[PDB]
Amino acid sequence: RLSQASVLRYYAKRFTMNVGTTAHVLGKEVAGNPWVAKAIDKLSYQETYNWISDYQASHLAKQVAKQVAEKYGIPPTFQGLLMAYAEKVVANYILDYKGESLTQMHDNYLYELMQKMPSSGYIYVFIGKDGKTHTVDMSKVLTDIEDALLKRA
Amino acid sequence: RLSQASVLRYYAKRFTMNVGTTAHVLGKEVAGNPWVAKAIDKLSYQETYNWISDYQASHLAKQVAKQVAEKYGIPPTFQGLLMAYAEKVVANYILDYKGESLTQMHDNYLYELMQKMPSSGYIYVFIGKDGKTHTVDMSKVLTDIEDALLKRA
Amino acid sequence: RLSQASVLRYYAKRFTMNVGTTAHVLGKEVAGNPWVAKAIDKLSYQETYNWISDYQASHLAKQVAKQVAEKYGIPPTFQGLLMAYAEKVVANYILDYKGESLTQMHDNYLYELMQKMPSSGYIYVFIGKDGKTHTVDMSKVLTDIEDALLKRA
Amino acid sequence: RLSQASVLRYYAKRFTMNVGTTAHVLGKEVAGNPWVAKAIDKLSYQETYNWISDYQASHLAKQVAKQVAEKYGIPPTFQGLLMAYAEKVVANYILDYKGESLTQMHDNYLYELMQKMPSSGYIYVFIGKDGKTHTVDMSKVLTDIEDALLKRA
Amino acid sequence: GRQAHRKFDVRNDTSTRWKGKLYGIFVNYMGEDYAKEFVEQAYSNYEKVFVNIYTKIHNQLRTTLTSSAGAGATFPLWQIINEAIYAVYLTHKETASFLYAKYVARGIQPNVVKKILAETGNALKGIVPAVAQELGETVLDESNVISVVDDIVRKNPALPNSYAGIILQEARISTTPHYEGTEGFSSMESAYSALEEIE
Amino acid sequence: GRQAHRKFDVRNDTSTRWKGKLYGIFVNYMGEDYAKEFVEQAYSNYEKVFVNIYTKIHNQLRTTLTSSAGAGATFPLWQIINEAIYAVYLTHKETASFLYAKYVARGIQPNVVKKILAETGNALKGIVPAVAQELGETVLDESNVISVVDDIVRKNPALPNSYAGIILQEARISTTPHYEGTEGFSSMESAYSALEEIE
Amino acid sequence: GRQAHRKFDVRNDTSTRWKGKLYGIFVNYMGEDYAKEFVEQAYSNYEKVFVNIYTKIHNQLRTTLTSSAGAGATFPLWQIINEAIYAVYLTHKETASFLYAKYVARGIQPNVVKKILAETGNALKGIVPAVAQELGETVLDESNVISVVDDIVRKNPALPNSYAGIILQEARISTTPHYEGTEGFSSMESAYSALEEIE
DNA sequence: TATATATATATA
DNA sequence: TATATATATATA
DNA sequence: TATATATATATA
DNA sequence: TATATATATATA
DNA sequence: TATATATATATA
DNA sequence: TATATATATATA
DNA sequence: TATATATATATA
DNA sequence: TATATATATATA
DNA sequence: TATATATATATA
DNA sequence: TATATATATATA
């Protein structure tokens, strides 16, 4: 997860590649002067601003995915593959609308989640903490995630 | 086939006959001095330049012949005799036009490809890889090769 | 087997015959100059490139032959004669298709592996490491090697 | 024994015979140029790599032979003839299995260690450092060396 | 959307990337000479352990995995071939029955797990010499894998984590593919490496 | 276009061209004395094998070939008279029926192949003594060649490649055309050679 | 495919090839004079040992081998005539029964092995004088070879490897085919050598 | 080095 | 054109 | 360097 | 095809 | 460099 | 296999 | 550093 | 798109 | 810095 | 997972 430290950690590591591109084969000579340090500092601050300022959509879709995933008792392993739709949909569909309809994309990624028996590959079986076995279908949980994201938006 | 090494291989073997003609009955005496080595080196480089720079027409005609030959399932043996027209035509006809018309040359080399029964000596029978027997006529495949070469040119 | 050193070993020994053909009866005189050493060096590098780059088919057929040979407990002596088909087939049949069918070639080399009693000369008897005697037929192991090579290709 | 210096000592002496085979009757002329020195250097390094990398089996069999030989108070002279089985067995039997069984080879080399009275030529008598005379049989010590090598492998 | 498609694999230059980045970090730490010397020995162990075992196993199992449960989400299953190497073999820490009972709960049906756990041993026995004699002369199959492989773990209790580590290959004998008579029959990459090296 | 018209044949000086070029190449290889001595023995085998068999067969078959399928493209057929010498005779590696079945696929109609394969044996029997007794006292013809010539190959299996090689002529007895009573009746070139040699 | 058909045999020029190549290698090693002198003595031993024994035996056994198990794969068997010379005769290291038991496992049926091991001794006794008296006045046959030939090896234990080597022929007496009264009756090659030498 | 059809760059 | 020096396009 | 079956790249 | 220059796949 | 038993990597 | 180029395991 | 599905900001 | 520089979401 | 069982936060 | 950077819980 990201918290506090993550922004600083992304900030720190831009310095090397930025001072590389400012002065290409002159590192030792150029980097000595304080001015270039000031400028390259000042530049490497705006890139993190663009990154963090323009990442909220993905984080909020990721946020919405979690509580819906938890309510079915989904184990940790599949939570990431469920996390897929969050930004597979809050990027291609709602912000810019690449030329596709929703249902065909729903079918497409379901063509990536299959079983391959030759079991219910669309309704997995899971074991809970109390030992109560219960099952969930991917189709309905996916329908819930897109319409929930649309209402949230 | 020629690739990379062929140019070097042609370059290497000019040295002996060139140092022979530079100094005729004085090989041991003359070749010792470095200067003559420099000059004969420098000369033997331009001959390969003339050869490779002025050979493209033949290679491209040879190129065009192959795919047309392959599409009829022609076996390897006759491919060379088909390769004949490639430069029999891209030399005498189109570059310089020696005083002949096309049809008579077409007849002439066909007077070199005959059968001699006393079979269809203009339509051979061939066995493919799958065992499917099929036949091709020389007249039409030749017509295809000249008009294809003309359009390519 | 070949590994690392083999390429260098083939490279080294081209130098003598190449400097021989570059300057025919002038070795001591010509080879002194550094330039000719540079050129003959540069030439002898491409020949190994052509050799190693264009040898993979044989090595992979040789690769496929081994595991099939081992699974029948074939002793070392006959492994080479089994190695025969590997490139007897990945050269004449699949790359260029000289004008033969498969079955007749299968019969031909079997006409080189016979017994000559006047025993099962197509089913030899072998003694394993544990003392368990078991037998293998050449016909089926050959059928396995060609269809395995074809699927591998 | 080999230690540190042995690898270098084997490396050094390949140079003469390698520069001989690279340029056959042209030593003084060719060896002057630095390039050939670079190449022949680079080649003579891989041969030692193959030698030392592929010699471990013999050294470990030699290792196992020693402690077993010492426990019977065998004097130095016969230790080499005992060293025989180490690689007489870790080469013909276990790595590649030439077509023999173990017992007959055991009999064969014992047909090389005999006495010839017309004494116990299979049970020699030895004098220790303290003056205590004791005897050992070759048959059992050989049985111990092969089964110990097999378990070690 | 659709910025790119990253791919992760061993790509003939991972060695130099790793060495360079960790040299850049440690050059301040110890000084130039020690830093330059250190990363070689640092990477040699990784090369000897990860590359020679896990890469080969994964490359062997890729085809059958895509055939068996091929999809976008082979992720939950990809860790099984990795787990079977460490916990069951080379440490004997966990019984095969325990792993089968555990990992079903995540939802993968038994047949694939049985096939994978058995198929791993067949390839692994050839690679690591120490496993072979302990396993003995047998052929693993899903019919009897759950019965047979756990027999050893029952007989021998939990081994220490040293055996998974550096003590693995040094004390055991074998032959490189160079020899002339073993199975082996060396791969071709040792030729392209030389061809590159010549210039 | 039309630079020249090269012709390829045995032209009474091939010996010296071959010897000189291969002496020029090997003079650096071994030293002058060994190089000068070596090429003589090197060329003697080629002279004994190629010249005494293949040249005579080709010179015999040229006329009937030009008569039968004379054209510019006798190339696909020229290799048959060369193939029949090695595979069928002198090694018994391939049955005549197999060759007939194989080589038709390239498109040459059967009658010419039958005529050539039979005509080759008639000339070959006179040249090589070892073939004669194995073939026996018979006359080959396209009517019965495919029936008769393959009989021997059926009876005797694939011979080793040594017999095609150097072991060919040394152990068998015959008479040079010099004698007085054999067929022979030596050619005239042995006179022009002397006339040249006298100066 | 079908690049060529290499043949390997002793071809009246192997001497000069060997001498020249090994002179080219050693000229840098020691200097010109020593290198020129050395290869003569180097090759004389090889000529005296390999040529005078193994070549004759192989040339004798070729015909019966092609008759007995003639095929492309006479390779597994070709080493028997070579092995019988060294291990059984001239060193007494291995009993004939042991060799028969060993080499059957490779799959060749007993009758051919019995015929070959017996036929080798008949030819070998004539060539090497030292073998004759030890073998005595007997005729070897597959009926009794396995009974008789191993008798000597039972009586006399494993001889050292010196006897296979240089000590072989020098101390024993015989007559060259030149004499007038022995079996001998010299071959004709000593005439072609002179005829070549005259020019 | 031969056995056939056309090539382009060099020695006379 | 004929003499022979080297390179490409398929099997002897 | 031999004794057998097929290889690919080079000298004629 | 035959002549001989070097490399791979098992034992003389 | 010899006097014996086995080695592995290289020149032919 | 035999020819000779270098390395290991005990005393001449 | 790998083994899979999607991310946004940067070097070419 | 493919090449590799850094950050997030679960186990090797 | 080693000899064993689990940790959480960082470099690749 | 394996590579090595630092902190906690008992004796070498």
Computed Rg of chain E: 20 Å
| Biggest chain contact | B-C, 24 and 25 residues
CA gyration radius of chain A, whole angstroms: 22 Å
The largest beta-sheet of chain A arranges its strands as: 1-2
Protein name (chains E, F, G): Structural protein
Domain Major capsid protein 1/2 C-terminal (chains A, B, C, D): 1-152
Protein name (chains A, B, C, D): Structural protein
PDB class: virus
Explain what you see.
The structure is cut from a larger assembly and holds 4 copies of chain A (153 residues) and 3 copies of chain E (199 residues). Chain A has helices at residues 5-12, 14-22, 28-31, 34-53, 56-71, 76-89, 102-110, 138-152, and strands at residues 123-127, 133-137. By secondary structure, chain A is mainly alpha-helical. The longest helix of chain A has 20 residues, at 34-53. In chain E, 12% of the residues are buried. Chain E is mainly α. Chain E has helices at residues 14-30, 32-69, 75-88, 96-104, 110-127, 129-135, 145-155, 189-197. In chain E, helix 2 packs across helix 5 (110-127), helix 3 (75-88) crosses helix 5 and helix 5 packs across helix 6. Chains in contact: A-E, B-C, B-F, C-D, C-E, C-F, C-G, D-E, D-F, D-G, F-G. The C-F interface holds C 16-17, 19-21, 24-25, 27, 99-100, 104, 108, 111-112, 114, 116 and F 24-29, 93-94, 98, 101-103, 105-106, 157-158. The structure holds 10 DNA strands. The PDB classes it as virus. The entry lists the keywords helical symmetry, archaeal virus, virus. Cryo-EM of AFV6. Chains A, B, C, D: MCP1. The organism of A, B, C, D is Acidianus filamentous virus 6.
Please outline the helices and strands.
This is part of a larger assembly, with four copies of chain A (153 residues) and three copies of chain E (199 residues).
Chain A: H1 5-12, H2 14-22, H3 28-31, H4 34-53, H5 56-71, H6 76-89, H7 102-110, E1 123-127, E2 133-137, H8 138-152
Antiparallel strand pairs in A: 1-2
Chain E: H1 14-30, H2 32-69, H3 75-88, H4 96-104, H5 110-127, H6 129-135, H7 145-155, H8 189-197
Helix pairs in contact in E: 1-2, 2-5, 3-5, 5-6
Chain E binds ten DNA strands through helix 1, helix 2 and helix 3.
